[PDB]
């Protein structure tokens, strides 16, 4: 039904109204004919000691198709330890396609705690955790010079602790 699927299109009219309104305040887009956009999805569903994240395959399907719709070539990696996630992020940062890209998306989906994202072998006795800080460090201008000046969007589906996130008030 088209490359963009269910993503509503920006008409060329709508693109020119945006483009000269905030002209010098918009990230530049590369020619569609030659650019090589990449995105990375890391999803942990089956764990050695933590309950299985049923429904994760729906998330992978939806986010993979969405990112392809927006023009990204999507790598999907599943069921990684935190060390494996680091190795894969370093490999993603080194990809030559980033030099002829204008942006990137990274999506992480797992169990989580306050400190960060759980790897497949995480346990209370032996934690296996990737911190958001490490993700930023691996993709910054020093460690990923190919993405200098380009937007890097990081999406994280995970708990950030055990609390319900609510308080009561009197109506």
């Amino acid at each position: 039904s088209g490359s963009e699927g269910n993503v509503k299109l920006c008409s060329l009219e709508e693109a020119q109204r945006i483009w000269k309104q905030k002209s010098a305040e918009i990230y530049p887009i590369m020619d569609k004919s030659s650019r090589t956009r990449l995105a990375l999805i890391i999803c942990n569903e089956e764990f050695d000691s933590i309950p299985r994240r049923t429904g994760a395959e729906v998330d992978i399907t939806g986010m993979t198709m969405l990112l392809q719709n927006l023009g990204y070539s999507v790598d999907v990696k599943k069921n990684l330890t935190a060390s494996d996630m680091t190795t894969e992020l370093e490999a993603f940062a080194h990809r030559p396609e980033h030099k002829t890209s204008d942006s990137t998306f990274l999506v992480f989906m797992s169990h989580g705690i306050r400190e960060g994202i759980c790897g497949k072998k995480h346990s209370e006795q032996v934690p296996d955790i990737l911190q958001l800080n490490a993700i930023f460090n691996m993709l910054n201008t020093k460690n990923c010079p190919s993405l200098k000046d380009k937007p890097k969007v990081i999406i994280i589906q995970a708990c950030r602790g055990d609390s319900p996130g609510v308080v009561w008030f009197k109506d």
Binding site: L9, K150, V153, C159
Partner: protein, 88 residues
């Protein structure tokens, strides 16, 4: 010659809940935040920049519904609007 660049710039992160708090998932419909993000990107990528889309996603969570959660934007160093220009 060499020139100096900011070591950290042009990032945005979007998390499914606020610090200390849980995020919800359904076995058949998937993770609530991911589905909500997909719906909003499909509807609004054509007209809104990424920071504005994420704000609309937060707004859609504003009313707790038994499984309250509030997605949070973190560590933002975008210096420009990021428009995705779908179709171009």
């Amino acid at each position: 010659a060499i020139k100096k660049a900011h070591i950290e710039k042009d990032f945005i992160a979007f998390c499914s809940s606020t610090p200390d708090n849980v995020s919800w998932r359904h076995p058949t419909m998937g993770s609530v935040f991911i589905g909500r993000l997909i719906e909003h990107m499909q509807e609004y990528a054509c007209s809104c920049d990424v920071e504005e889309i994420f704000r609309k996603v937060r707004f859609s969570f504003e009313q707790p519904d038994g499984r309250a959660q509030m997605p949070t934007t973190e560590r933002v160093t975008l210096t420009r609007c990021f428009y995705l220009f779908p179709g171009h």
